[PDB]
Amino acid sequence: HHHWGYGKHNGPEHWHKDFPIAKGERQSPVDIDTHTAKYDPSLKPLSVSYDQATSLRILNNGHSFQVTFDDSQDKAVLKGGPLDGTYRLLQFHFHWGSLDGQGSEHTVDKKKYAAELHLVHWNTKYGDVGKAVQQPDGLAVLGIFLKVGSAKPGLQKVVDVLDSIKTEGKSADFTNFDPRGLLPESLDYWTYPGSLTTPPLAECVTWIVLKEPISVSSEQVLKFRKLNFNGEGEPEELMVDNWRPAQPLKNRQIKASFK
Numbered sequence: 235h236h237h238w239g240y241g242k243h244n245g246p247e248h249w250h251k252d253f254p255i256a257k258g259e260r261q262s263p264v265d266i267d268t269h270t271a272k273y274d275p276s277l278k279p280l281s282v283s284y285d286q287a288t289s290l291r292i293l294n295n296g297h298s299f300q301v302t303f304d305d306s307q308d309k310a311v312l313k314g315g316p317l318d319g320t321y322r323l324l325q326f327h328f329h330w331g332s333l334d335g336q337g338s339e340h341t342v343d344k345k346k347y348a349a350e351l352h353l354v355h356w357n358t359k360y361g362d363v364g365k366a367v368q369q370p371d372g373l374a375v376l377g378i379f380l381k382v383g384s385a386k387p388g389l390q391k392v393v394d395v396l397d398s399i400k401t402e403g404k405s406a407d408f409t410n411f412d413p414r415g416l417l418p419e420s421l422d423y424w425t426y427p428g429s430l431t432t433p434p435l436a437e438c439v440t441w442i443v444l445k446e447p448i449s450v451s452s453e454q455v456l457k458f459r460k461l462n463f464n465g466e467g468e469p470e471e472l473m474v475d476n477w478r479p480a481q482p483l484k485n486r487q488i489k490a491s492f493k
């Protein structure tokens with residue numbers, strides 16, 4: 235359980251009261267201004283190696299739903315792009331809106347997408363996620379925008395279990411899932427140094443935000459929107475608009491992998 239949320243009283247505007255790093259120098263998300271984000275030809279190609287992925291559980295954590303992976307060995311890993319070394323996939327989760335016109339955390343020329351998928355990875359130079367979160371290169375989060383259109387067949391297994399995890403703390407087995415089914419065809423990206431977008435807002439993340447959104451259906455996104463922030467029998471707070479808005483870029487540069 236957790237004290238914070240996305241309401242007027244417990245939401246992003248107030249997180250700095252408990253997490254003063256909320257007003258820090260490398261906070262996420264950010265707007266990606268395509269007039270000022272510059273192509274960097276020294277960026278390597280991004281390497282997604284998810285064939286050996288081992289999914290474990292799906293959980294309503296009170297702010298989102300998350301799907302966890304066995305990160306005890308190099309199985310599903312992210313390498314290349316801006317990264318040095320190997321980063322193991324730990325979990326994925328989403329942020330979404332009440333309406334299709336909002337829901338993403340990152341924006342592109344101020345445009346908000348209907349949702350955003352985060353695949354969270356940690357740097358194996360550290361022992362575990364707990365050590366990695368204390369370092370500036372501890373995590374790599376691969377961010378993928380969702381737009382509404384045709385169904386994403388690789389999302390359907392997720393959508394099909396959401397009715398079983400409606401309220402905070404509900405969970406299920408979630409085995410044999412292939413996260414490659416959530417990727418777009420193109421791996422062109424923007425990258426910058428930032429932070430977790432949820433508490434504790436640690437400044438430990440290399441963000442890799444893909445340019446090409448995936449398409450999901452209205453049925454699929456509606457299932458997201460029928461989840462609850464609350465626990466069982468508590469006053470219903472539909473789980474929508476669980477996104478932090480864009481934060482000041484301060485001294486940073488966003489780099490593009492493409493011209």
Ligand SMILES: [Zn+2]
Pocket residue numbers: 235236
């Ligand atoms: Zn807790």
Ligand SMILES: [Zn+2]
Pocket residue numbers: 327328329352431
């Ligand atoms: Zn996230």
